Amino acid sequence: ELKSTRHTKYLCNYHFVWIPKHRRNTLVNEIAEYTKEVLKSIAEELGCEIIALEVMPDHIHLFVNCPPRYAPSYLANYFKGKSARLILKKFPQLNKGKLWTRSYFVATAGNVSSEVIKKYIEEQWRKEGE
Amino acid sequence: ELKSTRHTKYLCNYHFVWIPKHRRNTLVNEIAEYTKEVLKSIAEELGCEIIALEVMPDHIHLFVNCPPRYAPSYLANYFKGKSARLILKKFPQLNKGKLWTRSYFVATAGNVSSEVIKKYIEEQWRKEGE
Ligand SMILES: [Mn+2]
Ligand SMILES: [Mn+2]
């Protein structure tokens, strides 16, 4: 749903997708479970609401609702960078270089109805006055 | 369409909506014209692609595709902040108080297909190797 901040009404959903560096059977078993845990922890840290999270052997698909103060690149690098530090610190048998590649995919999601926009405009005028 | 940078494939579309302060009949004629010109110049400046722009007497509805480096709040405040400065400069009669209110609405837009995501994943593994 639409959320509100100081002087803001927003709905910011993003699909973030990225892959583990070189092994296609990296994110499995306990490693996959810890990966989900840390990504959820980071989301909570940033005030983001995870809509869907998939940690598959060959990729991560994170669909999340975030505050408007964050740029998609800032978010991707925070999720990837912080999760990698934690995951590599936890499992020694990894720790051989980078966990992720330096690329990521991001796509905005949403279908704002004209009624929702019309209503926001009417509300601002009602609030501010003419 | 999907776009790409150094190490990112992205689709970042946002709807920005905001209204002028108690003047519900000022964004007309020459002022409306200049406002549209200024918002288009700012978009070009930031590397954003305007999908649709509406400058109406009671509100601005900016639908734009932007680089992932920008936060929605930065964009909203830059578009509003810089246009206000330029507009008040060209039309001194608007120099009384703030041109815009401090509020704004922002909503992400998009319906990315699974095929696009699947292709991104396969392309990264093809480039990275396993
Ligand atoms: Mn998926
Ligand atoms: Mn509109």
Side-chain angles (χ1 to χ4, degrees), chain A residues 9 15 41 82 90 98 117 124-125:
Chain A
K9 297 291 187 309
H15 286 277
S41 176
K82 190 152 183 179
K90 175 134 190 198
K98 299 289 180 176
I117 294 277
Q124 293 314 298
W125 277 104

Side-chain angles (χ1 to χ4, degrees), chain A residues 7 9-11 13 22 24 58 68 70-73 102-104 106-112 117 120-121 125 130, chain B residues 6-11 13 15 22 58-59 68 72-73 102-104 106-111 120 125 128-130:
Chain A
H7 9 62
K9 297 291 187 309
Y10 61 88
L11 214 178
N13 295 337
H22 298 108
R24 272 191 109 122
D58 66 338
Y70 299 117
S73 292
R102 191 165 62 156
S103 173
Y104 72 85
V106 61
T108 43
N111 293 104
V112 201
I117 294 277
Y120 170 80
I121 296 168
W125 277 104
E130 297 166 34
Chain B
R6 204 163 200 280
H7 11 60
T8 90
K9 287 295 166 299
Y10 77 84
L11 178 269
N13 304 318
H15 287 280
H22 351 280
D58 63 353
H59 79 288
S73 296
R102 188 45 181 62
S103 299
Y104 74 82
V106 58
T108 44
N111 294 117
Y120 169 79
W125 278 103
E128 286 321 312
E130 3 187 315

Side-chain angles (χ1 to χ4, degrees), chain A residues 44-88:
Chain A
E44 227 263 50
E45 184 191 338
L46 301 173
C48 299
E49 173 180 350
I50 290 174
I51 303 169
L53 175 64
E54 297 176 320
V55 175
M56 305 298 299
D58 66 338
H59 80 287
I60 288 175
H61 181 180
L62 172 68
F63 187 34
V64 59
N65 175 281
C66 322
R69 63 180 181 270
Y70 299 117
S73 292
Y74 180 89
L75 288 163
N77 290 312
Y78 207 105
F79 277 113
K80 288 183 63 183
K82 190 152 183 179
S83 66
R85 169 248 268 174
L86 292 177
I87 296 170
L88 293 178

Side-chain angles (χ1 to χ4, degrees), chain B residues 11-40:
Chain B
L11 178 269
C12 297
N13 304 318
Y14 310 98
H15 287 280
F16 289 99
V17 180
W18 70 84
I19 70 166
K21 216 195 181 182
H22 351 280
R23 293 191 189 90
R24 187 153 182 168
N25 309 287
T26 295
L27 294 185
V28 302
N29 302 119
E30 291 81 14
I31 302 183
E33 287 169 23
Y34 188 58
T35 296
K36 194 179 186 63
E37 292 173 3
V38 162
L39 296 175
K40 288 176 182 302

